[PDB]
Design a protein around this ligand. Sequence first.
Ligand SMILES: *[C@@H]1O[C@H](CO)[C@@H](O)[C@H](O)[C@H]1NC(C)=O
Ligand SMILES: *[C@@H]1O[C@H](CO)[C@@H](O)[C@H](O)[C@@H]1O
Ligand SMILES: *[C@@H]1O[C@H](CO)[C@@H](O)[C@H](O)[C@@H]1O
Ligand SMILES: *[C@@H]1O[C@H](CO)[C@@H](O)[C@H](O)[C@@H]1O
Ligand SMILES: *[C@@H]1O[C@H](CO)[C@@H](O)[C@H](O)[C@@H]1O
Ligand SMILES: *[C@@H]1O[C@H](CO)[C@@H](O)[C@H](O)[C@@H]1O
Ligand SMILES: [Ca+2]
Ligand SMILES: [Ca+2]
Lengths: 48, 487, 482
Amino acid sequence: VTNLPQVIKQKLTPLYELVKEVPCASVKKLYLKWALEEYLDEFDPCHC
Amino acid sequence: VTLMPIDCELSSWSSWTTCDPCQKKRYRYAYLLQPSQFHGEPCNFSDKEVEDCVTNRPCRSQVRCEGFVCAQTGRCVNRRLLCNGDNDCGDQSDEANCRRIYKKCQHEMDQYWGIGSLASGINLFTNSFEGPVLDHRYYAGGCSPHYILNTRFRKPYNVESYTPQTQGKYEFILKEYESYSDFERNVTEKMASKDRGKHYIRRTKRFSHTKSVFLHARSDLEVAHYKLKPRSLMLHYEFLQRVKRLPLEYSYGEYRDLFRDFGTHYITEAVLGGIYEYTLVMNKEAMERGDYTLNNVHARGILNEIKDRNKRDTMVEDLVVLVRGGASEHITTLAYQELPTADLMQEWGDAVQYNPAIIKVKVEPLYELVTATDFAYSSTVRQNMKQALEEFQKEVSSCHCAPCQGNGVPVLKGSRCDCICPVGSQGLACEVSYRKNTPIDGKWNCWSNWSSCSGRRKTRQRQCNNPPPQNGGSPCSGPASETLDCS
Amino acid sequence: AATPAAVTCQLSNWSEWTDCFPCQDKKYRHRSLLQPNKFGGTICSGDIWDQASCSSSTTCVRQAQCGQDFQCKETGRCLKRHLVCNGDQDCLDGSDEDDCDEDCSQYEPIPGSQKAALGYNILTQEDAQSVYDASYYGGQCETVYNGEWRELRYDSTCERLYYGDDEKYFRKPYNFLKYHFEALADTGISSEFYDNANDLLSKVKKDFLNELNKYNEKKFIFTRIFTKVQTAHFKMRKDDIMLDEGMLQSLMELPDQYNYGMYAKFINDYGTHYITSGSMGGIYEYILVIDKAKMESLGITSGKTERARKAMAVEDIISRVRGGSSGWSGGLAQNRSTITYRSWGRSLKYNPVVIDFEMQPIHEVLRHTSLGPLEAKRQNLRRALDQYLMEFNACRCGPCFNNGVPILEGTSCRCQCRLGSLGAACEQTQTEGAKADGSWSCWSSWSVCRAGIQERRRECDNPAPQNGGASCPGRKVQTQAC
Ligand SMILES: *[C@@H]1O[C@H](CO)[C@@H](O)[C@H](O)[C@H]1NC(C)=O
Ligand SMILES: *[C@@H]1O[C@H](CO)[C@@H](O)[C@H](O)[C@@H]1O
Ligand SMILES: *[C@@H]1O[C@H](CO)[C@@H](O)[C@H](O)[C@@H]1O
Ligand SMILES: *[C@@H]1O[C@H](CO)[C@@H](O)[C@H](O)[C@@H]1O
Ligand SMILES: *[C@@H]1O[C@H](CO)[C@@H](O)[C@H](O)[C@@H]1O
Ligand SMILES: *[C@@H]1O[C@H](CO)[C@@H](O)[C@H](O)[C@@H]1O
Ligand SMILES: [Ca+2]
Ligand SMILES: [Ca+2]
């Protein structure tokens, strides 16, 4: 395992925080947020 | 065997399409209407007929190769790839007349194992790689150093990540059930006088025993993960050349051959693995009856005596092993009937690193490859290909195939349906077995194509297929009826 | 057992000669394979097909037959222009490298490159002459990774036990669309046992006496073991085929008019079928089946006494290895063990077999070639095959005892019996209670026809099956377009 690992424990940042050096990145950051919020709104187990 | 074989039928032909402006040919096709089965005769005829044309409609087929035309293959390559010391054209054309060559890769670098195998599209319905769609020998500059263990590798331009993602599961179960019964019942009666006498006897036994042993052990080993890029893809030239040969007119047969040659969908994300499934299944039974009786009279005298004794013992046992990655020396010893000693298992998994199968995969429809930077009139070729892809799924989906005996599974390769037979039954339809009965798993007939627009419906039945005959398993895997908006 | 049906071989009277075709320089004629021998009787001195030298009625056609690009004058192949002086040998004359930089020959041809290019004979299960060109590359440098390459070496000079760089890559022939190198195996095992006994008595006495006893004991074992291993699988191309040069010339040498002989000869030389796709493997099957029984009975009365016993044991055992080394396939033939499987598997690295494949009838090859449509010839080739699969068919090889395989060796049938000498009465150790199937009698010729009716006919076998034996897949009539 010292020669072939995997990720075991994780601390997270929301994906939208990465958007950088693309056209309209400023807006795309918020839109990827609202899209993630809406993704979570589809995906949240509360529907089940 | 209870058979009369089904010979192939294709339909009567379509009308011709009008002549294509760019391919300068016209096409006619037939649907596969009934597959070859029970060794009934094939009628395949390579599923198509085509003819030349004399029409003069304008054509815009000259989508510009901006870089350099690969003289044999008809690929284009960007000008920084000429004289990179690598074959970007397929036929080494790009490296002709190099006033100098510049190398990039500082060391030898293996292809990741199976990376050229992942390069081919799948027929999603046979679940098979068909043929080559993306050029996994193309390196776009590349030469970035990647490592697995201490081995070093080159990543094909088409691939986002190949990484070990090195995960393993083992799941084991053992089960035993046993049950025993024994019953003994007797009678005795007597009389005497001074002359006469009488006697009677019965003794009995009934007995039973049962056992099962069931064992299942599965391991899934997942020591690479592949993801293909979403788009900006570089195509394998043999695919690219059938795509440049598709009509802009619609006539399903020429589009059908692309799915036959290059698959229905391209593999976009896959986990790459070895599997070692082992199952051992045993049912055992025993029974006995013993019975013994006498009768006597005395006055002169008479005796009667009887014995009846019986035994049965049986085992039915099945074992299956499937292994799907590794090297042939390990693979055969794992494939041996005995539960593998952990040394074998070690050397097998070590070789899975060098020859994986696909474990689980997410696929995209092949028309997302068809692109305006690669083909003229691309969007018409896409719309055509989307329609043909739907019609092709209706042909390749197994549902046409008459049901196998012995719970056999159809996969419908080419234009023949062949029933894969489980352990314990044999022959063309999987009829021939020593066993009394087998549970059957359900699948539908082919679904009704659509109802009218303004709300549209599809419907399915299981009339022969159904589980209840000889007490089968699950009937279902999806919705027994289906409906949608027209737009 | 039934008496033998041995007869001396007959060919037909000759047909009249074909005329002296230009470039071919030959007359041909044929005999119709009228009746090759049953399992006994002396062979035909003659043969089906004839060639004789003759001068032609007109001058031979020039290499303009290939059109706008080069053709190697002393052989068949019409070539795309880029192949001339590509640095690789594209035709049997080699003139495509005469009077002038591919390095791709660095990699050896893919394992199975030969047997997948060879044609095939559904009447005899044999290979045939090359149909595809097993070594044609079309200028392609198409390399394939060897998923089995891993093999150990040791180095005394530096203390490494490690896996060798040899065999890592193969050159794919242009005629293979893909050849995939994924490792798989699948094994399926059954065991079933049944074991029974019964024991019974009765007695009466009066003052006469009578006593009776019965015994039975029985055992059965069945097992089947199947394994398949695969090192790679492949599919041949279905458009722009490059034929074998031998196939190509042997095709151009065919008449535009329908005469059976030359098309029958190309069928016989290039095979009834061509392999469209296959899998490269080692298969081991093992099958082991046993029966035993023992019985007794006693009777006493007053007096006199009598007793009898009868018992049986029979074992069928098969071990068969396809693929592997000659040495280790002897090991795994002789013994099933954790020994014999592992080294057999190591030998499948080096010597695989095509284990399973799919195919098309030979005439379909032409439409998929670069030659352009040959429809008149293609229909003559089909029309001949539609007689050939009646005429050359192992169906005519007649009764085989003890489930023996009927096969036509060229002009003469064999019945390969699994025990004893071949032909009639293959058994003298087994009793007349032995079990053997009914299997097909041949197709008829195409029968006399009407606007909506034509027939061809079969029989499931001539006799019934031997004792409890199995039967054919079940047909009597098939129909045709008249
Ligand atoms: C192979 O030999 C081994 C060791 O002597 C023996 O245990 C085994 O039964 C043999 N198997 C076969 C198939 O003969
Ligand atoms: C297309 O298909 C029908 C069905 O056999 C034939 O009569 C003919 O080939 C038609 O053109
Ligand atoms: C018919 O229609 C659907 C398409 O959504 C098929 O997937 C299915 O076979 C159904 O019966
Ligand atoms: C071929 O066969 C005839 C009989 O048909 C003989 O007269 C002669 O052998 C000819 O060559
Ligand atoms: C009987 O069987 C062969 C094998 O299919 C056919 O090709 C032919 O019709 C023959 O008479
Ligand atoms: C009869 O012999 C076998 C058993 O069906 C087949 O391979 C073939 O169909 C032939 O007619
Ligand atoms: Ca280059
Ligand atoms: Ca050359």
